[PDB]
Design a protein around this ligand. Sequence first.
Ligand code: CL
Ligand code: CL
Lengths: 163, 163
Amino acid sequence: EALSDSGLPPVQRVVTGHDAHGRAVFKSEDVTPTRMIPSGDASFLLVWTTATVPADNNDETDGRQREAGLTLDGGSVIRVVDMLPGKESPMHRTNSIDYGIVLEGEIELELDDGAKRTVRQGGIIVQRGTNHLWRNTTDKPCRIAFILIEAPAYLHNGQPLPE
Amino acid sequence: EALSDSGLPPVQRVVTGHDAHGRAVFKSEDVTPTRMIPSGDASFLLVWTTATVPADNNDETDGRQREAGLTLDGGSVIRVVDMLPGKESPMHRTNSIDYGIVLEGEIELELDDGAKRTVRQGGIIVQRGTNHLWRNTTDKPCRIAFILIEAPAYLHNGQPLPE
Ligand SMILES: [Cl-]
Ligand SMILES: [Cl-]
């Protein structure tokens, strides 16, 4: 419980579960800052993961503390990413569909060949396994919640794309 | 493009995809209001669905317009729900893990046997297949983005729970 390294508020996480009596109860609650990555471009927080999709509500593991699996981008991931002003992410593609929700500020999404657009605060991105980067061209941080869900490699003319 | 029935702004949706040349491009963009459900308790918007998890980035279907599947709560769903002031949702349990993100306002999450707590703006809920309702005990609407991901029925002493 400190301000995030981006200068934005820490994030409350509330996790539910079942007790020994099969009742729905609160499992954990915490308020935790996003923290700076080495590049200094973004401040982030992992919130949860599932080892598989479909998920397992009999898996009592804390998703924030789960050992690394096999399948790159296997299962699901929810994290919070604070893009810092004047910064951008590395361009890349993943084997997933991602739902991105702009919580605070706004963000420039750039795809292939210079294509780009702005996603305003409250906006949602459906990222369908596309090559992209995120760029903050504003003077304030932008917070985005990302949910990444396993999908096979995208098939172009029945084959994987070049990286 | 009108104000939502909750009085909150409409929601921008940006969807990515691949073109015939295997390039990452923008597939669609829209700004759409949440709309009132018959009960008058909430105003909602479906954003996307996947028929399965893992998902399929070769499935060009608009997730907002996908025909109903077999598996109740099969695949994934992202929707926006605006809980109206002084209103609450029906209590229920689903076969899913859900990530909920409070975009605006705050919300009371109630589980079994009267257990409840407040999730503040910017807060995240990890709902692990638990019986719950959402209650807005404030004088302003509360907007929550929900992502629901297929999971088997929760097993208590190796058996499904009573409904
Ligand atoms: Cl936990
Ligand atoms: Cl679409």
